[PDB]
Design an enzyme around this catalytic site. Structure first.
Site, PDB file in Angstrom:
ATOM      1  N   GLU A 151      27.906   7.091 -10.523  1.00 51.76           N
ATOM      2  CA  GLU A 151      28.712   8.035  -9.753  1.00 51.76           C
ATOM      3  C   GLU A 151      28.197   8.155  -8.330  1.00 51.76           C
ATOM      4  O   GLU A 151      28.977   8.205  -7.371  1.00 51.76           O
ATOM      5  CB  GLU A 151      28.688   9.411 -10.415  1.00 51.76           C
TER       6      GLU A 151
ATOM      7  N   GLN B  74       0.825  -1.204   0.000  1.00 50.29           N
ATOM      8  CA  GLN B  74       0.000   0.000   0.000  1.00 50.29           C
ATOM      9  C   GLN B  74       0.861   1.256   0.000  1.00 50.29           C
ATOM     10  O   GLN B  74       0.604   2.203  -0.756  1.00 50.29           O
ATOM     11  CB  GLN B  74      -0.930  -0.012   1.211  1.00 50.29           C
TER      12      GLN B  74
ATOM     13  N   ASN C  29       8.225   8.356   9.485  1.00 46.70           N
ATOM     14  CA  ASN C  29       6.993   9.127   9.377  1.00 46.70           C
ATOM     15  C   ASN C  29       6.996  10.327  10.317  1.00 46.70           C
ATOM     16  O   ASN C  29       6.501  11.402   9.955  1.00 46.70           O
ATOM     17  CB  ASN C  29       5.789   8.230   9.652  1.00 46.70           C
TER      18      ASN C  29
HETATM   19  N1  LIG Z   1       4.856   7.455   4.221  1.00 44.12           N
HETATM   20  C1  LIG Z   1       3.836   6.618   4.068  1.00 44.12           C
HETATM   21  N2  LIG Z   1       3.794   5.446   4.792  1.00 44.12           N
HETATM   22  C2  LIG Z   1       2.759   4.589   4.642  1.00 44.12           C
HETATM   23  C3  LIG Z   1       1.735   4.882   3.761  1.00 44.12           C
HETATM   24  N3  LIG Z   1       0.844   3.872   3.807  1.00 44.12           N
HETATM   25  C4  LIG Z   1       1.279   2.949   4.691  1.00 44.12           C
HETATM   26  N4  LIG Z   1       2.461   3.385   5.222  1.00 44.12           N
HETATM   27  C5  LIG Z   1       3.275   2.670   6.215  1.00 44.12           C
HETATM   28  O1  LIG Z   1       3.153   1.279   5.993  1.00 44.12           O
HETATM   29  C6  LIG Z   1       2.894   0.590   7.195  1.00 44.12           C
HETATM   30  C7  LIG Z   1       1.928  -0.559   6.935  1.00 44.12           C
HETATM   31  O2  LIG Z   1       2.565  -1.536   6.144  1.00 44.12           O
HETATM   32  P1  LIG Z   1       2.198  -1.730   4.592  1.00 44.12           P
HETATM   33  O3  LIG Z   1       3.444  -1.873   3.758  1.00 44.12           O
HETATM   34  O4  LIG Z   1       1.347  -0.590   4.101  1.00 44.12           O
HETATM   35  O5  LIG Z   1       1.366  -3.099   4.539  1.00 44.12           O
HETATM   36  P2  LIG Z   1       0.736  -3.532   3.132  1.00 44.12           P
HETATM   37  O6  LIG Z   1       1.529  -2.912   2.011  1.00 44.12           O
HETATM   38  O7  LIG Z   1      -0.717  -3.134   3.075  1.00 44.12           O
HETATM   39  O8  LIG Z   1       0.875  -5.130   3.102  1.00 44.12           O
HETATM   40  P3  LIG Z   1       0.096  -5.998   4.205  1.00 44.12           P
HETATM   41  O9  LIG Z   1       0.832  -5.928   5.518  1.00 44.12           O
HETATM   42  O10 LIG Z   1      -0.002  -7.430   3.748  1.00 44.12           O
HETATM   43  O11 LIG Z   1      -1.285  -5.420   4.367  1.00 44.12           O
HETATM   44  C8  LIG Z   1       2.331   1.609   8.164  1.00 44.12           C
HETATM   45  O12 LIG Z   1       2.845   1.419   9.459  1.00 44.12           O
HETATM   46  C9  LIG Z   1       2.750   2.956   7.617  1.00 44.12           C
HETATM   47  O13 LIG Z   1       3.698   3.542   8.485  1.00 44.12           O
HETATM   48  C10 LIG Z   1       1.772   6.058   3.030  1.00 44.12           C
HETATM   49  O14 LIG Z   1       0.865   6.323   2.248  1.00 44.12           O
HETATM   50  N5  LIG Z   1       2.825   6.926   3.186  1.00 44.12           N
HETATM   51 MG   LIG Z   2      -1.030  -4.931   2.450  1.00 42.17          MG
END
Ligand SMILES: Nc1nc2c(ncn2[C@@H]2O[C@H](COP(=O)(O)OP(=O)(O)OP(=O)(O)O)[C@@H](O)[C@H]2O)c(=O)[nH]1
Ligand SMILES: [Mg+2]
Ligand SMILES: CC(=O)O[C@H]1C(=O)[C@@]2(C)[C@H]([C@H](OC(=O)c3ccccc3)[C@]3(O)C[C@H](OC(=O)[C@H](O)[C@@H](NC(=O)c4ccccc4)c4ccccc4)C(C)=C1C3(C)C)[C@]1(OC(C)=O)CO[C@@H]1C[C@@H]2O
Ligand SMILES: Nc1ncnc2c1ncn2[C@@H]1O[C@H](COP(=O)(O)OP(=O)(O)NP(=O)(O)O)[C@@H](O)[C@H]1O
Ligand SMILES: Nc1nc2c(ncn2[C@@H]2O[C@H](COP(=O)(O)OP(=O)(O)O)[C@@H](O)[C@H]2O)c(=O)[nH]1
Ligand SMILES: [Mg+2]
EC number: 3.6.5.-
Lengths: 430, 440, 370
Positions: free
Chosen positions: B254, B11, B206
Site C-alpha cells: 500500500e 560502517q 546529517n
Molecule cells: N548518520 C550516520 N552517518 C554515518 C555514520 N557513519 C558514517 N556515516 C556517513 O558515511 C560516510 C562515510 O562513508 P561510509 O559508508 O561509512 O564508508 P564505509 O562504509 O566505511 O566504506 P569505505 O568507504 O570502504 O570505508 C560519512 O561521510 C558519513 O557522513 C553514522 O554512524 N551515522
Molecule cells: Mg568502509
C-alpha cells in the site's frame, strides 16, 4: 421460509459485519456461545432467516467472511462474538491487494474466488427457499472493491433470479484516507450498476456529521459508525422476521423503489437519535419520527436531498402505532414539500409497518430514499478521476496487472451515462 | 508471517543496524542474549514476532539480518559487544582491505569474492521465510563500500528475486558538511543503481538531523549515536504496521502504491514530528493537530531542502499510540486549507493515513521523551531536485580537470562511465521538472 | 433516417384455419384499414403508410404487392438514399409465428425473394457493373446472436463461453473476439446465412413450431474506392448495412410456456420493451430539435438498458438510417398485437439522423505532401 446469505469482504466489510451480527444476535436473543437465552416466543419464530440450527441446540450465523489479509480475520475471531462464526467460513489468503483494484479483481482475487464461491454454493444449497444475498464492502479500498465486484458478478451468473443487496461505503468528498480512491471507486461503480438489484450508499462524512451534530458524541470511533450502519441493516429486513400490519420483503421494496433498471442507488436513514440526555424532553410519536426521517442532515449518504428530487422513498416503521397517523403523515410530507417529489409518480411513498420494535425503544423507523441528488456524488468522483487520468498519475500500478486504458474509458463512460440518466428527471415543468 | 529481511552495508549501515536492533529488542522484550523471559512469565503469545526474529527450538530468537562490510573493525565491534550472542556468527565480513572511498574498488575488484557468499546467506535466510514482504537495505552514499558493494548487491538481488519490494535508507552527502573529498564521484556513480533497481529510496542528511538535535532535543554536542537512534525510530514507524494491530494498517505494498506516481520518481522525504526532550515534554499538549502541523515545518525535515520551493505530490502519515481518526481528519482538513503548502493539481486526494495502537518505546539512555502519541510522515515532493542539483555542480567542478580519476580507472573502471552516470542524473532531474508542471 | 414500416399480411396458417379464417386487414393505395373482429360495427382503425402490403392472395394482381414492389418502394430507394455515407438498419419487429423470416429471406429459388436476397444481389450486381481497373470495392460480413443478455458467435466454431461486449472510445460498442469475414459474391452471403440460421437456438411453441429464442444480427461493411489518382481520392465511400431478426413478443396466455421456455420468453419481452422505448424516445428527440427550434439542450436515449439497443447504438439512431418490417397476420387473435406494432410505428417512421463520412486520409496525404 426465506433465507438471506450474508457476505462481507475487506476490513470495513468485516467490521460492519461483526457489529451487525452483534445487533441481530441481541434482537433474536443469541448468546455469544450460540445458545438461546431469550424470553419471547417470537424470537424463535423466524430464526432460520439469518441462522442455521446446530446439532447441539445452538445457532450458527449464515455468514461468509472473506479477505486477502489474515489480520482482520484474527481481529474478528479474537472478539466478543468471534466464537459464533463457524471456522470453515473464514476464507482468506496472504499478500493482500493493498488498495490496488486490479490485484483484487484480476491477479490475487481470481485465485481465491473459487474457494469463496464454494462456501457460498454450499450455504445456499441448504436453504429451503433463498430470498437473496447481501454484501458489505468499502469501494475505496482494493480487496473490498475487487473481490466484492468479482463475487457479485459470479453470483449473478450463478443465481439470476435471486436478490442482490449491497451496503457499500463510498469515498467521501473531503475526507480521503487513500490516494487512489477515485480509480477503485470508478471501477467498482462501473461493475455495480450492471450486476445489482439494490445498493445502499454510505459515506463516512455523513456518519461523522450524525455523530457530532445529532448524537453529540465527543470522540466517535468506527464502532459508532458501524453501530449506525448495523441499525440500518437490521431495520431493512425487519418484515421477514416478525409479524405486522403491512409486511414488506426485500423484493417488495425493489419493485416499489426501482422505476428503471439502472436507478438502484438508495440513501438510507434511521430514526430516532436522541443524543443520550435529550430523550426525556422529546416525546416519541409518529410525527416526530417522520420529521427526523425526512430531515436533510439525518441522511447517511452526504448528499443534500433538497438539491434534487425524490424519485421514490420507503418508510419501514417498527412498533405499535395507528395506520391512519402514518398514512396522513406521509400524505402531509408529500403535499407540503411538493417541489421535491417528481410529478409523474403519484403517491411515491412506500409504507411498511412491523409491530415488534427494538428492545430498548417504544418505536423506530427506517428511511430508504431514491432521489436525483445521488448523481452529485458520482459527478464528484468523475471529476477526481479525470484529474488523475489525463496525466496517468498512478496508472502504471494498474496496467502492470494486465488492465489497459480502454477499461478505464469504459468505466468513465458508463459512470457519465448513469449521471446523465439520473439528471434526466431532475428538472421542472418538462 | 509478514517477514522482511534487513541488510546493512558499510560502517554507516552497521551502526544504524546496531541502533535499529537495540530498538527492536527493546520493543519486543527480547533480552540481549536472545531470550524472552516475558513469554515464560506470561506463558503464551506471539511476542516472538516473525517480522524480524526467527524463533528456534530452545526459545532463542535470531534476528533476520545480514551485516556486510570490508573493514574488520566495525563488525568486530559488534562481535565482541553487548549483543555478541544475539546475532548468528555468520556476520559476512571480508578479512581484507576496504574500498577506501573508491566506487570502482568496491564494485569491480574487491566487491567480488564476497558477493557470492553474501547472496548464499541471503538465500538461506529467504528459504526459512514464508510470505516475504521485502528487503530493507541500509547503506550510505559517498563511501566506497556502501556505494559499490550496494550497487553490485542490488543488481544481483534484482536479477534473482525481482518482484520482491526493496527499500533504501541512505545517508546522502550534505550541502556543505562532508567527511571525504571524493563523495560526489561515488554518489554520481551510484545514482544508476539506486534509480534502476530500488523500488523506493529515502534520503537522510546529517546536517538536518544535527539541526533537529540542536533545536528540538537541546543536545549541543551530538554524535552518530543520536542520529542512528532517530533513523531507527523512522524505520520502526515505517514497519510498525506489520507487527501490531491498529485501526488502519498499511503494509509495504500500500505504501509503495500510494507514494510512487511513476516508476522513476520514487524518492520521498521522511520526517518525525514529536522529537522533543523530557524537559520540554511538559508544557506541551502534543495533540494530533500539533504533531501533524509540525510534520510540515521546513525546519523539521530530515534533508536540507525547502518544501516551499517545490510541490507536494503525495503524502503518507503513519500514527502511533492514542490517536482517533476524527483528529487525523481534522488535521488533514486544516492542512489542505493552508496556502503555503502547494499540491500538484493532478492529485486531488494526496493523502494516505495509517493508525497503530502501539505507542513508541523509550530506549534507556536515549534522548527522546516518553510520549503517548506520535506520527511519522513520508512525503513525495519535487523539492528533492534541489538536493541533487547542488551535488551535480560539485561533480562538474571536479570532473572538468579529471581530478582523482586515475584512482578510479586504476581499478578497472572505464572513464566514459563517469559521463554516462552524470547523464542519468540529468535525465532524472529533467523528469522532476516535467512532473510538477500544471496541466493544461 | 427512416423506418418505412412495411405493414405486411401473409396467407393463413393451420392454427388460424382452425378458427374462423377471415382476414381483418384491407387497404386502398396508401390507406390501411384494420377491422375489429370483436366490434365489426366500429369504423376500422385507419393508418397512412406508403409501404403497406398485402400478400395473403399471392396469385392476384389487382392491388397485389409483390416482393419486387416492396423492394422498389423500400429496398433500392433506401439503399440509394443512404448510399451517400449512412448506416442502414433493417430489422424485423413482430410476433411469434408472424412470418418474420419470409420478409427477411423469402423464396430464394423463386423470383419472389425477401429483402436480403434482393438487396444483396442488387448491390453485388451494382459493384460488378462498376468494377474496373481504377474502381474497386470490398465487402465484409459478420453474424451474431443474443440469447439472454449474452452474445454468442454463430459463424465461428463452438465457443461455449459468451463474448464480452466492449466499448471503443471512438468506434462505440462492439463485441470482443467476434468472428468477421470477407466476402466476394452473393452466393457466399446466401451460404453464410444458411449456416447462421442453422446455428441459432430454436424451440417449438403452439403459435409456431420453430420459434427462434434469440435476437440475431447480420452486419455488412461495404467499402468503395475510385483510383483516378490525378484528380480523385481512393476509398471514397463506406457503408454499414445491418440486417437484424428479433424474436417476437411471447404472448404467454396464447403459448403456455413453462420452465426454461418461459424464462426465454420473459427475457425476450423485456428486450423488446426496451427496444420499443428507444424507438419511441429517439423519434421524439429527433422530431424536437429538427422541427421545433434547434435548441439542442440535452436528450437522453436509454441505450444501456439492454444489450440489443447497446450494440445497435450506432445503427438504431444518431447518425443512421433505419428500417422496420411490421410482419402482421390476418387473424383476429393478433388484432391487439398488430395495433401495438402499428402504434409503435406511429411512434416511428422518420427517426431523422444525419451522416456523410468515410474519407481516405492516407490517399489525400499524397497530394498534401507533394
Ligand atoms: N548518520 C550516520 N552517518 C554515518 C555514520 N557513519 C558514517 N556515516 C556517513 O558515511 C560516510 C562515510 O562513508 P561510509 O559508508 O561509512 O564508508 P564505509 O562504509 O566505511 O566504506 P569505505 O568507504 O570502504 O570505508 C560519512 O561521510 C558519513 O557522513 C553514522 O554512524 N551515522
Ligand atoms: Mg568502509
Ligand atoms: C436511556 C435510553 O433511552 O437509552 C437509549 C438511548 O439513550 C438512545 C439514545 C439509544 C442509545 O444509542 C446510542 O447511544 C448510540 C450510539 C452510537 C450509535 C448508535 C446509537 C443506546 O445505546 C441504544 C439502545 O437501543 C438499543 O440497544 C437498540 O435495541 C439497538 N441495539 C443496539 O444498540 C445494540 C448494541 C449492541 C448490542 C446489541 C444491540 C437496535 C436498534 C435498531 C435495530 C436493532 C437494535 C437504547 C434504546 C438506548 C441506549 C442503550 C443508550 C439510541 O440507539 C439507536 C438505536 O440509535 C441512539 O438513538 C437511539 C435513541 C435512544 O434514546
Ligand atoms: N407472401 C408469402 N407468400 C407465401 N408464403 C408466405 C408468404 N409470407 C410468408 N409465407 C410463408 O409463411 C411462413 C412464414 O414463416 P414462419 O414459419 O412464420 O417463420 P417466422 O414466423 O418468421 N419465425 P418467427 O416469426 O421469428 O417466430 C413460411 O412457411 C413462409 O413460406
Ligand atoms: N465505517 C467504517 N469505515 C471503515 C472502517 N474501516 C475502514 N473504513 C473505510 O474504508 C476505507 C478503506 O477501505 P479498506 O477497508 O482498507 O478496503 P480493503 O483494503 O480492500 O479491505 C477507508 O476510506 C475508511 O474510511 C470501519 O471500521 N468502519
Ligand atoms: Mg420470424
Amino acid at each position: 421460509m426465506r433465507e438471506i446469505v450474508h457476505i462481507q469482504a475487506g476490513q470495513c466489510g468485516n467490521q460492519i459485519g461483526a457489529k451487525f451480527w452483534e445487533v441481530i444476535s441481541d434482537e433474536h436473543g443469541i448468546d455469544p456461545t450460540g445458545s438461546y437465552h431469550g424470553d419471547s416466543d417470537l424470537q424463535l419464530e423466524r430464526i432460520n432467516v439469518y441462522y442455521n440450527e446446530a446439532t447441539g441446540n445452538k445457532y450458527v450465523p449464515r455468514a461468509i467472511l472473506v479477505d486477502l489479509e489474515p489480520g482482520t480475520m484474527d481481529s474478528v475471531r479474537s472478539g466478543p462474538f468471534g466464537q459464533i462464526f463457524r471456522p470453515d467460513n473464514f476464507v482468506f489468503g496472504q499478500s493482500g491487494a493493498g488498495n490496488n483494484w486490479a490485484k483484487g479483481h484480476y491477479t490475487e482475487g481470481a485465485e481465491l474466488v473459487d474457494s469463496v464461491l464454494d462456501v457460498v454454493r454450499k450455504e445456499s444449497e441448504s436453504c429451503d427457499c433463498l430470498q437473496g444475498f447481501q454484501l458489505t464492502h468499502s469501494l475505496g479500498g482494493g480487496t473490498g472493491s475487487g473481490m466484492g465486484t468479482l463475487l457479485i458478478s459470479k453470483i449473478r451468473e450463478e443465481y439470476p433470479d435471486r436478490i442482490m443487496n449491497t451496503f457499500s461505503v463510498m469515498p467521501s468528498p473531503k475526507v480521503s484516507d487513500t490516494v487512489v480512491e477515485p480509480y477503485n471507486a470508478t471501477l467498482s461503480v462501473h461493475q455495480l450498476v450492471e450486476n445489482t438489484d439494490e445498493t445502499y450508499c454510505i459515506d463516512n462524512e455523513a456518519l461523522y456529521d450524525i455523530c457530532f451534530r445529532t448524537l453529540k458524541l465527543t470522540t466517535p470511533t468506527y464502532g459508532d459508525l458501524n453501530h449506525l450502519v448495523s441499525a440500518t441493516m437490521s431495520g431493512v429486513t425487519t418484515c421477514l422476521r416478525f409479524p405486522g400490519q403491512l409486511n414488506a420483503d426485500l423484493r417488495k421494496l425493489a419493485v416499489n423503489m426501482v422505476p428503471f433498471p439502472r436507478l438502484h442507488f438508495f440513501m438510507p436513514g434511521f430514526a430516532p437519535l436522541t443524543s443520550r440526555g435529550s430523550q426525556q424532553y422529546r416525546a416519541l410519536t409518529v410525527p416526530e419520527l417522520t420529521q427526523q426521517m425526512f430531515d436533510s442532515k439525518n441522511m447517511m449518504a452526504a448528499c443534500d436531498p433538497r438539491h434534487g428530487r425524490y424519485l421514490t422513498v420507503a418508510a419501514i416503521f417498527r412498533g405499535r402505532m395507528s395506520m391512519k397517523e402514518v398514512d396522513e403523515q406521509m400524505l402531509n410530507v408529500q403535499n407540503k414539500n411538493s417541489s421535491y417529489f417528481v410529478e409523474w409518480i403519484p403517491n411515491n411513498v412506500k409504507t411498511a409497518v412491523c409491530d415488534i420494535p427494538p428492545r430498548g425503544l417504544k418505536m423506530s423507523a427506517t428511511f430508504i430514499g431514491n432521489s436525483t441528488a445521488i448523481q452529485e456524488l458520482f459527478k464528484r468522483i468523475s471529476e477526481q478521476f479525470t484529474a488523475m487520468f489525463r496525466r496517468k498519475a498512478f496508472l502504471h500500478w494498474y496496467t502492470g496487472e494486465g488492465m489497459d486504458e480502454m477499461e478505464f474509458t469504459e468505466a468513465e463512460s458508463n459512470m457519465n451515462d448513469l449521471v446523465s440518466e439520473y439528471q434526466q428527471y431532475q428538472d421542472a415543468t418538462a | 508471517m509478514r517477514e522482511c529481511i534487513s541488510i546493512h552495508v558499510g560502517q554507516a549501515g552497521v551502526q544504524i543496524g546496531n541502533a535499529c536492533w537495540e530498538l527492536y529488542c527493546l520493543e519486543h522484550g527480547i533480552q540481549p542474549d536472545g531470550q524472552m523471559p516475558s513469554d515464560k512469565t506470561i506463558g503464551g503469545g506471539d511476542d516472538s514476532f516473525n517480522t524480524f526474529f526467527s524463533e528456534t527450538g530452545a526459545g532463542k530468537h535470531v534476528p533476520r539480518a545480514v551485516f556486510v562490510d570490508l573493514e574488520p573493525t566495525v563488525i568486530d565491534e559488534v562481535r565482541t559487544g553487548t549483543y555478541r550472542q544475539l546475532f548468528h556468527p555468520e556476520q559476512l565480513i571480508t578479512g581484507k582491505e576496504d574500498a577506501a572511498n573508491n566506487y570502482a574498488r568496491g564494485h569491480y575488484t574487491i566487491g567480488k569474492e564476497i558477493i557470492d557468499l553474501v547472496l548464499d546467506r541471503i538465500r538461506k535466510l529467504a528459504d526459512q521465510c514464508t510470505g516475504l514482504q521485502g528487503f530493507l537495505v541500509f547503506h550510505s552514499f559517498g563511501g566506497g563500500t556502501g556505494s559499490g558493494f550496494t550497487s553490485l548487491l542490488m543488481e544481483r538481488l534484482s536479477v534473482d528475486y525481482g518482484k520482491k519490494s526493496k527499500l533504501e535508507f541512505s545517508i546522502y552527502p550534505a550541502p556543505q558538511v562532508s567527511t571525504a573529498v571524493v563523495e560526489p564521484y561515488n554518489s554520481i556513480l551510484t545514482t544508476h543503481t539506486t534509480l534502476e533497481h530500488s523500488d523506493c529510496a529515502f534520503m537522510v542528511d546529517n546536517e538536518a538531523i544535527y539541526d533537529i538535535c540542536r533545536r528540538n532535543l537541546d543536545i549541543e554536542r551530538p554524535t552518530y549515536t543520536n542520529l542512528n537512534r532517530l533513523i531507527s525510530q523512522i524505520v520502526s514507524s515505517i514497519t510498525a504496521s506489520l507487527r501490531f494491530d491498529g485501526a488502519l494498517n498499511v503494509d509495504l505494498t500500500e505504501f509503495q502504491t500510494n507514494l510512487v506516481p511513476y516508476p522513476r520518481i520514487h524518492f520521498p522525504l521522511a520526517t518525525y514530528a514529536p522529537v522533543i526532550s523530557a524537559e520540554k515534554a511538559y508544557h506541551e499538549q502534543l495533540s494530533v493537530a500539533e504533531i501533524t502541523n509540525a510534520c510540515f515545518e521546513p525546519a523539521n525535515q530530515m534533508v536540507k531542502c525547502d518544501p516551499r520551493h517545490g510541490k507536494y505530490m503525495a503524502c503518507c502519515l503513519l500514527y502511533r499510540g492514542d490517536v482517533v481518526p476524527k483528529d487525523v481528519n481534522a488535521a488533514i482538513a486544516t492542512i489542505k486549507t493552508k496556502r503555503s503548502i502547494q499540491f500538484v493539481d493532478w492529485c486531488p486526494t494526496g493523502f494516505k493515513v495509517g493508525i497503530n495502537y502501539q505507542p513508541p518505546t523509550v530506549v534507556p539512555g536515549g534522548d527522546l521523551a516518553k510520549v503517548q502519541r506520535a506520527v511519522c510522515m513520508l512525503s513525495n515532493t519535487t523539492a528533492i531536485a534541489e538536493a541533487w542539483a547542488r551535488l551535480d555542480h560539485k561533480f562538474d567542478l571536479m570532473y572538468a580537470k579529471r581530478a582523482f580519476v586515475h584512482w578510479y580507472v586504476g581499478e578497472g573502471m572505464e572513464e566514459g562511465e563517469f559521463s554516462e552516470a552524470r547523464e542519468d542524473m540529468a535525465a532524472l532531474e529533467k523528469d522532476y521538472e516535467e512532473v510538477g508542471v500544471d496541466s493544461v | 433516417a427512416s423506418v418505412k414500416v412495411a405493414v405486411r399480411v401473409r396467407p393463413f396458417n393451420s392454427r388460424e384455419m382452425s378458427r374462423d379464417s377471415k382476414c381483418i386487414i384491407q387497404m386502398s393505395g396508401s390507406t390501411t384499414t384494420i377491422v375489429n373482429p370483436k366490434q365489426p360495427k366500429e369504423t376500422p382503425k385507419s393508418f397512412s403508410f406508403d409501404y403497406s402490403y398485402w400478400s395473403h392472395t399471392s396469385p392476384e394482381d389487382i392491388n397485389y404487392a409483390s416482393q419486387k414492389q416492396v423492394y422498389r418502394d423500400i429496398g433500392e430507394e433506401m439503399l440509394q438514399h443512404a448510399f451517400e455515407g449512412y448506416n442502414v438498419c433493417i430489422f424485423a419487429y413482430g410476433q411469434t409465428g408472424a412470418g418474420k423470416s419470409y420478409t427477411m429471406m423469402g423464396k430464394q429459388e423463386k423470383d419472389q425473394q425477401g429483402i436480403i436476397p434482393q438487396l444483396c444481389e442488387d448491390l453485388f450486381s451494382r459493384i460488378n457493373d462498376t468494377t474496373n481497373d481504377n474502381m474497386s470495392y470490398s465487402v465484409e460480413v459478420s453474424y451474431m446472436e443474443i440469447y439472454c443478455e449474452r452474445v454468442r458467435d454463430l459463424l465461428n466454431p463452438k465457443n461455449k463461453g459468451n463474448l464480452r461486449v466492449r466499448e471503443h472510445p471512438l468506434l462505440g460498442p462492439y463485441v470482443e473476439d467476434l468472428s468477421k469475414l470477407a466476402v466476394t459474391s452473393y452466393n457466399d452471403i446466401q451460404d453464410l446465412m444458411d449456416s447462421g440460421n442453422k446455428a441459432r437456438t430454436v424451440a417449438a411453441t403452439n403459435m409456431n413450431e420453430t420459434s427462434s429464442r434469440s435476437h440475431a444480427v447480420f452486419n455488412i461493411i461495404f467499402t468503395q474506392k475510385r483510383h483516378d489518382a490525378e484528380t480523385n481520392i481512393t476509398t471514397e465511400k463506406v457503408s454499414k448495412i445491418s440486417l437484424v431478426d428479433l424474436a417476437g413478443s411471447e404472448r404467454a396466455d396464447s403459448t403456455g410456456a413453462k420452465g426454461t421456455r418461459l424464462k426465454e420468453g420473459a427475457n425476450i419481452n423485456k428486450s423488446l420493451t426496451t427496444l420499443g422505448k428507444v424507438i419511441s424516445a429517439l423519434a421524439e428527440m429527433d422530431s424536437g430539435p429538427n422541427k421545433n427550434k434547434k435548441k439542442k439542450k440535452t436528450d437522453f436515449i436509454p441505450y444501456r438498458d439492454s444489450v440489443l439497443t447497446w450494440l445497435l447504438r450506432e445503427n438504431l439512431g444518431g447518425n443512421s438510417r433505419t428500417a422496420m418490417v411490421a410482419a402482421l397476420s390476418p387473424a383476429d387473435i393478433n388484432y391487439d398485437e398488430t395495433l401495438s406494432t402499428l402504434r409503435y410505428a406511429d411512434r416511428a417512421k422518420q427517426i431523422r439522423c444525419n451522416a456523410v463520412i468515410n474519407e481516405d486520409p492516407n490517399n489525400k496525404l499524397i497530394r498534401e505532401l507533394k
